Design a protein around this ligand. Sequence first.
Ligand SMILES: O=C(CCCCNC(=O)Nc1ccc(S(=O)(=O)N2CCN(c3cc(Cl)cc(C(F)(F)F)c3)CC2)cc1)NO
Ligand SMILES: [Mn+2]
Ligand SMILES: [Mn+2]
Length: 238
Amino acid sequence: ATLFIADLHLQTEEPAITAGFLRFLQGEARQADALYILGDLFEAWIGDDDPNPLHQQIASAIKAVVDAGVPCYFIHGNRDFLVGQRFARQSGMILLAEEERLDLYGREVLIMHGDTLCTDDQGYLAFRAKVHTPWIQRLFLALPLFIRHRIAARMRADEIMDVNPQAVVDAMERHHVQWLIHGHTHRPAVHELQANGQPAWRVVLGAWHSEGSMVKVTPDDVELIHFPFLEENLYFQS
Ligand SMILES: O=C(CCCCNC(=O)Nc1ccc(S(=O)(=O)N2CCN(c3cc(Cl)cc(C(F)(F)F)c3)CC2)cc1)NO
Ligand SMILES: [Mn+2]
Ligand SMILES: [Mn+2]
């Protein structure tokens, strides 16, 4: 099986999510053929030189999955688009492009974070175009870490728009797939549509708000799975 997760929004103020992700990496992920993280792994990212201990904790945990023989891949989200090759090396993850076509047991599947499908949010797409401009990222990353932290804290102090159905069809026809997996919108669901003259499906990951969410693709099926962060020990009441 191949696993997909997204929209964890890890942060030191939410240790329950971190614990849930560490439990996921120690258990389920170790049995996978591959793990794809489709963006928004972190609530924020201001560059790989950030000494935030959570980053090293997460990198070590992911690296243990990689060393266990499970390749891990990352597509950037709207929150963590500055994740770079230094973190990729620390974590053992492979950085992928904003759209990737996968062969999953003979099924061609398009994966992406999903924010680029939300083409009705014209203001966001303009912001996205700016912060994905390479010379702008290079200038921001050049600023001192304490400045970047102040910029980020100020900006974060300032409802997620859903996908545009025509953008979905465009993407699945550009890639000639019948299957699309994405996150970003926080509306876990399976949508049927038509692409390339045939039925097509759009599978949406959940955010890790109160429980975890993953998509698990097998040779036989596609599974959207919700599970508790921590081991829920049963006990009995007379
Ligand atoms: O609705 C939708 C979309 C949903 C809403 C999208 N909004 C959203 O993602 N906001 C946001 C994301 C990340 C952060 S951050 O804290 O991690 N961090 C802030 C500073 N960052 C920066 C980088 C560069 Cl290159 C340049 C600058 C500059 F020039 F501004 F200083 C700053 C790096 C990132 C802060 C806010 N879809 O339907
Ligand atoms: Mn998200
Ligand atoms: Mn997002």
